Design an enzyme around this catalytic site. Sequence first.
Site, mmCIF file in Angstrom:
data_model
loop_
_atom_site.group_PDB
_atom_site.id
_atom_site.type_symbol
_atom_site.label_atom_id
_atom_site.label_comp_id
_atom_site.label_asym_id
_atom_site.label_seq_id
_atom_site.Cartn_x
_atom_site.Cartn_y
_atom_site.Cartn_z
ATOM 1 N N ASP A 1 63.539 -88.723 -68.094
ATOM 2 C CA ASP A 1 64.066 -87.381 -68.286
ATOM 3 C C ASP A 1 63.861 -86.613 -66.998
ATOM 4 O O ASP A 1 62.782 -86.541 -66.463
ATOM 5 C CB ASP A 1 63.400 -86.691 -69.483
ATOM 6 C CG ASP A 1 63.673 -87.414 -70.792
ATOM 7 O OD1 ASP A 1 62.800 -87.413 -71.658
ATOM 8 O OD2 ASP A 1 64.731 -88.039 -70.937
ATOM 9 N N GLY B 1 63.480 -96.083 -78.219
ATOM 10 C CA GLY B 1 62.624 -97.267 -78.343
ATOM 11 C C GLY B 1 61.198 -97.021 -77.860
ATOM 12 O O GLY B 1 60.243 -97.237 -78.609
ATOM 13 N N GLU C 1 70.483 -97.574 -78.460
ATOM 14 C CA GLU C 1 70.502 -97.075 -77.103
ATOM 15 C C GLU C 1 70.552 -98.212 -76.046
ATOM 16 O O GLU C 1 70.484 -97.951 -74.852
ATOM 17 C CB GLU C 1 69.320 -96.123 -76.881
ATOM 18 C CG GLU C 1 69.563 -94.731 -77.398
ATOM 19 C CD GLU C 1 68.473 -93.750 -76.984
ATOM 20 O OE1 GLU C 1 67.366 -94.177 -76.557
ATOM 21 O OE2 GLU C 1 68.739 -92.538 -77.083
ATOM 22 N N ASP D 1 58.507 -77.599 -81.469
ATOM 23 C CA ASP D 1 59.552 -78.435 -80.857
ATOM 24 C C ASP D 1 59.703 -79.706 -81.703
ATOM 25 O O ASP D 1 58.787 -80.527 -81.764
ATOM 26 C CB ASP D 1 59.164 -78.799 -79.426
ATOM 27 C CG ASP D 1 60.166 -79.755 -78.753
ATOM 28 O OD1 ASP D 1 61.367 -79.743 -79.134
ATOM 29 O OD2 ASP D 1 59.751 -80.505 -77.828
ATOM 30 N N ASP E 1 61.644 -90.242 -84.007
ATOM 31 C CA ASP E 1 61.018 -91.398 -83.363
ATOM 32 C C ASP E 1 59.535 -91.483 -83.737
ATOM 33 O O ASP E 1 58.972 -92.574 -83.847
ATOM 34 C CB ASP E 1 61.203 -91.356 -81.829
ATOM 35 C CG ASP E 1 62.676 -91.377 -81.410
ATOM 36 O OD1 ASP E 1 63.508 -92.016 -82.100
ATOM 37 O OD2 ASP E 1 63.016 -90.730 -80.390
HETATM 38 N N1 LIG Z 1 59.955 -78.450 -89.273
HETATM 39 C C1 LIG Z 1 59.392 -79.592 -89.709
HETATM 40 N N2 LIG Z 1 58.269 -79.566 -90.463
HETATM 41 C C2 LIG Z 1 57.669 -80.696 -90.915
HETATM 42 N N3 LIG Z 1 58.147 -81.924 -90.653
HETATM 43 C C3 LIG Z 1 59.269 -82.081 -89.899
HETATM 44 C C4 LIG Z 1 59.976 -80.908 -89.380
HETATM 45 N N4 LIG Z 1 61.033 -81.357 -88.685
HETATM 46 C C5 LIG Z 1 61.007 -82.713 -88.759
HETATM 47 N N5 LIG Z 1 59.945 -83.132 -89.501
HETATM 48 C C6 LIG Z 1 59.551 -84.529 -89.825
HETATM 49 O O1 LIG Z 1 60.193 -85.459 -88.943
HETATM 50 C C7 LIG Z 1 60.973 -86.385 -89.692
HETATM 51 C C8 LIG Z 1 62.200 -86.662 -88.849
HETATM 52 O O2 LIG Z 1 62.902 -85.440 -88.655
HETATM 53 P P1 LIG Z 1 64.489 -85.339 -88.430
HETATM 54 O O3 LIG Z 1 64.679 -83.968 -87.780
HETATM 55 O O4 LIG Z 1 65.186 -85.708 -89.728
HETATM 56 O O5 LIG Z 1 64.701 -86.609 -87.428
HETATM 57 P P2 LIG Z 1 65.443 -86.680 -85.943
HETATM 58 O O6 LIG Z 1 64.319 -86.494 -84.907
HETATM 59 O O7 LIG Z 1 66.103 -88.049 -85.987
HETATM 60 O O8 LIG Z 1 66.470 -85.559 -85.937
HETATM 61 C C9 LIG Z 1 61.226 -85.719 -91.045
HETATM 62 O O9 LIG Z 1 61.443 -86.627 -92.140
HETATM 63 C C10 LIG Z 1 59.972 -84.912 -91.233
HETATM 64 O O10 LIG Z 1 58.966 -85.697 -91.872
HETATM 65 MG MG LIG Z 2 65.999 -90.096 -84.879
HETATM 66 NA NA NA Z 3 57.183 -82.229 -80.622
#
Ligand SMILES: Nc1ncnc2c1ncn2[C@@H]1O[C@H](COP(=O)(O)OP(=O)(O)O)[C@@H](O)[C@H]1O
Ligand SMILES: [Mg+2]
Ligand code: NA
Lengths: 308, 308
Positions: free
Chosen positions: B13, B41, B140, B249, B255
């Site tokens: 990055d 990954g 990826e 964030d 991942d």
């Molecule tokens: N604001 C949040 N509070 C608590 N857990 C979160 C939050 N955002 C994401 N997560 C956790 O991270 C997992 C993956 O988030 P998601 O945003 O669906 O995946 P990606 O990073 O692929 O977009 C969720 O199932 C949840 O357990």
């Molecule tokens: Mg993902």
């Molecule tokens: Na984070």
Amino acid sequence: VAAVVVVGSCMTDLVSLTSRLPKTGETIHGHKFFIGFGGKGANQCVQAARLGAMTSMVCKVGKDSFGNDYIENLKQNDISTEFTYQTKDAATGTASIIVNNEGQNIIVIVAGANLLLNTEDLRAAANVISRAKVMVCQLEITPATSLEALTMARRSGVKTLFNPAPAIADLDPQFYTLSDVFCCNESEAEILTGLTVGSAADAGEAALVLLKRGCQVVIITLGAEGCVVLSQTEPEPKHIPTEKVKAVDTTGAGDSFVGALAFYLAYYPNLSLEDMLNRSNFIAAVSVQAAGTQSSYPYKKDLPLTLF
Amino acid sequence: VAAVVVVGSCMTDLVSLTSRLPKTGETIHGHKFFIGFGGKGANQCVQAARLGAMTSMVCKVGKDSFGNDYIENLKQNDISTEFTYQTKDAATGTASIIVNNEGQNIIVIVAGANLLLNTEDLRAAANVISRAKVMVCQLEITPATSLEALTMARRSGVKTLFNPAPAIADLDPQFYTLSDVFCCNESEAEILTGLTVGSAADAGEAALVLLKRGCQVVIITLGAEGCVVLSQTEPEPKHIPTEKVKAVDTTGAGDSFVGALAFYLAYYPNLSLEDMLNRSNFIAAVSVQAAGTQSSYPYKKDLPLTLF
Ligand SMILES: Nc1ncnc2c1ncn2[C@@H]1O[C@H](COP(=O)(O)OP(=O)(O)O)[C@@H](O)[C@H]1O
Ligand SMILES: [Mg+2]
Ligand code: NA
Ligand SMILES: Nc1ncnc2c1ncn2[C@@H]1O[C@H](COP(=O)(O)OP(=O)(O)O)[C@@H](O)[C@H]1O
Ligand SMILES: [Mg+2]
Ligand code: NA
């Protein structure tokens, strides 16, 4: 009533996975061992059963844990075990398979109890055999028993599907004249005829020799090239391509093909052979995309409606 | 010996911070530039590693400074780099990221060396792949490479965890049938199914479409709503909520979730799927409370003893 009766073999696959195959005299360490249900007869019966066929497996296993497990495998696949015998005189047939990371193998088959399926075992099955539409045989039991199975079916007007696998160079002439559908692969055709089969045109040459020996229909399977077929009524060879697909594990693909063809011969007799073979090529093309032989044979539910 | 093997991407990055984003033809001045470590990954592999997993990262980077740095980032995360390849023919995979005061961004991803991981590299990695407890892949690297990795794992009885990210509309059908656990987020599920996936109800319908394609287990992650899970042996969708937390964030939370799930699949295989996902939710939820992607992934050290 069993529409498809398979008279043939049951084998416990005993599989060791290694990084390299051992050499003569050496002891090496593998990383995983597992058991599979194999044997051409059972494999063919399992594919026909999963497509929806009412099947019955005539076979012999040992009065051991392997045989008890094989009986339960057949039952789990809704296959009749009325004439699945068990014997104290031999172990269930076995295939010790060693496979390296390149997919290269070494296999030792011990036919075992499969060799003890005899003519009296068969006569006890006379009534199931005569009410069946299709009779499926291979060469993993005593040839004399396969030949007698073919004769009984032929005497009761039942369609015979014979798979000369593994192939014997001096196969008894009577096998050909008792076969309505004679189905083998490129390697078996080479053994049976002495011709080299490395193309579909080569397979057409080898198929005509097998047809002159007395078969009604000859099919030679060609892996990814599909199959070639000849008959007494249309003796001109015709190549039938299969679906161009990424293969995960081709083991038992021919058995899926034969089991599928059995099903179409018994349940879809008013379809043309070329159509049955297209459909059988497809089912077999689906099994090559999954691992584990019987684990790779698809169900009617998981196939296109266009195959039924 | 690696219990979790991740076959996938590593990307560098390249982050520029500015006051405003540039328009076509404009050179703007930013106020800071920094390098970060990414790639789905590697992200997944880092989280599994931090949880205590013995891991290996099968990947391809450039024979350049970015690649040597990536190798040291992996080592500093106690990940085996014995199958981290380098190539002269492309740069290490990069994400060029420009971020303004408002928090808006433009990102340009160049897959680079990631797309040169080939089947010969997988063949050389065959022993680590086949000796694993779980094999994790994403989208990826070259999809053919991910499909061949899933094929090797499946043939060796190794659990496959597939994360189709970033999603592709016409994903080859074998990706589903070769997936033991098929895990994606809302927008990935919408791309793969053509359904709206906004809520746990929607994810339930979508996960069902995916399960009927051949997956053994489908998990759709739902951000703050946690996740939804279905399976062949339990076709009924179940909703696992997550922690209500103040997110700082959420980048790379998916991942974190996947690396955690791989850890539990490999080290706690008799736990129920629900139990694993509730722990993985918790872990991904911790990551959400800090910035920095891999930087936010917590260690076994800093977590509740009841998660283990
Ligand atoms: N604001 C949040 N509070 C608590 N857990 C979160 C939050 N955002 C994401 N997560 C956790 O991270 C997992 C993956 O988030 P998601 O945003 O669906 O995946 P990606 O990073 O692929 O977009 C969720 O199932 C949840 O357990
Ligand atoms: Mg993902
Ligand atoms: Na984070
Ligand atoms: N790579 C492949 N792609 C598509 N179909 C295949 C492939 N390999 C095998 N088949 C199908 O399986 C059938 C039997 O394959 P073959 O390898 O000839 O039999 P055997 O398993 O007896 O060696 C073929 O006629 C074909 O329909
Ligand atoms: Mg065969
Ligand atoms: Na197969």
